[PDB]
């Protein structure tokens, strides 16, 4: 059907699509949705100090 | 089983003609070379076909067809993405507009009509004249 370079390229595109489909790209630890739930942890880390 | 006939003679081609819509008509025989079939040699114009549709003198109108290459179908990802081989796209209507007109008195003529001409399309939709697409030869 098609040559082998085409198959390599298709494999790489499938790799990228799969790595995106895992729903881990939106996670940023400096978020606000993150600092809303880890505020008490830091507060008690500072008052435990 | 008798062999088919085989005669040979000197023949004189007919004079060439210009019907306005088509030109040609020098074949002096009634049959063709590859197939043994009779050749249509009467030509019907555009206004003639329109009137024959309006006044019911025409029953069936048939178009020839064309193969429609495989890359130009949209029913599956392109061939070149490496998928399984899709069967075959349906055939097109003849781009050149070659057409056969069948009358109610049994006559059969040919014509050139573009598929999608406004007047002819409206006439075929209104008067319900039978429309057909001639399948492709092997």
UniProtKB/TrEMBL annotation, chain A:
This is Cell division protein. The chain holds residues 1219 to 1267 of 2971 of the full protein.
